[PDB]
Design a protein around this ligand. Sequence first.
Ligand SMILES: */C=C/C1=C(C)C(=O)N/C1=C\C1=NC(=C\c2[nH]c(/C=C3\NC(=O)C(C=C)=C3C)c(C)c2CCC(=O)O)/C(CCC(=O)O)=C1C
Length: 483
Amino acid sequence: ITPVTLANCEDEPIHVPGAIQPHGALVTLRADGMVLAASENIQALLGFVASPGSYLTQEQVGPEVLRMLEEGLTGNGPWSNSVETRIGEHLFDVIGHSYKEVFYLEFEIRTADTLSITSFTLNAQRIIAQVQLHNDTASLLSNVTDELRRMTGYDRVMAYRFRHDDSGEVVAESRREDLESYLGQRYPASDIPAQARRLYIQNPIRLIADVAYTPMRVFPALNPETNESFDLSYSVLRSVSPIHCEYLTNMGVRASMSISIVVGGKLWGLFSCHHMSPKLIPYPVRMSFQIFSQVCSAIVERLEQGRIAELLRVSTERRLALARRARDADDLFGALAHPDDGIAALIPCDGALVMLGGRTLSIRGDFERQAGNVLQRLQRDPERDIYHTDNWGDCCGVLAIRFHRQESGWIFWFRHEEVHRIRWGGKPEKLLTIGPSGPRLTPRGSFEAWEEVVRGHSTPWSETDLAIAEKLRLDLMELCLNH
Ligand SMILES: */C=C/C1=C(C)C(=O)N/C1=C\C1=NC(=C\c2[nH]c(/C=C3\NC(=O)C(C=C)=C3C)c(C)c2CCC(=O)O)/C(CCC(=O)O)=C1C
């Protein structure tokens, strides 16, 4: 019965809302096919009253439907299927699935004049051609963002990248003129709490037909079998958190639809479509996006590792240049401090320090004091050959490696505090009408929430950045020992 406030919202059970969106009806069955619960609108949408204890009957739901249901009813492992069928006055999409051991049948009115197979195929071809045309991982995102809008007619579609700390950044955008831009918006990991994030990962597509909707409750609330709520995780019609709804209306959005990009076990980022009036996307089309989601995820994965590959390649090429120079010139300092192949170019940094013997070369600033303090901190830890941190002198980020012990051969890279890369301003943008929860649920409030998180922090060191440092360290050890 608990109200969901700003304090609660982190722990909101959004998977068991026990209600569904109004653009469809829902019937929940148990293993034997016996009805356990239904949305309060089954009668109003489909001509009949589903009742707990009942079993579904032909042409109160039609034949092919039970035909489908029986197949999944007798199959081990998460059944999933859909049928198209006429029930009374209308034809329906009857998407059905089984999660836990409860079976779900979802009913959407089908208004499309097209054959489903071809509608599905047509859109799949169109939206994944965008995945064959681009080598830049950012062109991919940018282009499919522009294309998703062309296909769906959404007012605004955005592509979100998720950082290491699960904070988000709007990296692409295609929007109708009128609308303010959110390009470069960065948002925290909290803007999408655990359960919501778990769900985007498990579900390629989420659709919100109308944010201003009144939910259609499924009765009864609790599954008699367990005396605990129905887990609508894989339910297409599952209802929305009032918090998110308030957020979206603060923005002035009325319909959403998001396509996930999952790589590893991580939500790599999603495409968020936003409409200013309510909007619906037919089932077969959503399936076009679902399959797309899986392929795009695959290509983004490769494109990203193709990116790291090239980073490693030019790094070694520079380690080669470095090895070449060092042996022939015989001062390392000159080699390391080289303007372009120098260490400052090896790994993205705002500065670097080279330190062998008693001599100190600070390149791109005065870093001698910091390096001294960092080194003192490592006093307590004589065995550390590598040190790094984004919390901390005057530079937040530090990556230090040791290549000579006795003569204190050290290398440092430094990073300043992370800064909002792109920022809007210039003319006060319009007044958002703000709900009861407060300004926290506006983009402006989200951004501020993000600042408070990152400030005091430099950008984390790449998986890649550390790998390079490690290779460099090996190089110099080799050199110093060798000659
Ligand atoms: C207390 C937890 C939450 C805060 C704070 C908050 O802002 N939202 C919170 C809970 C959820 N958010 C969910 C999804 C979600 N989050 C945002 C916020 C942004 N995304 C952006 O890209 C930007 C700016 C560029 C912002 C400000 C949005 C738009 C959404 C909608 C999901 C989508 O776009 O697909 C969320 C899950 C929602 C769901 O159930 O679909 C929760 C629970």
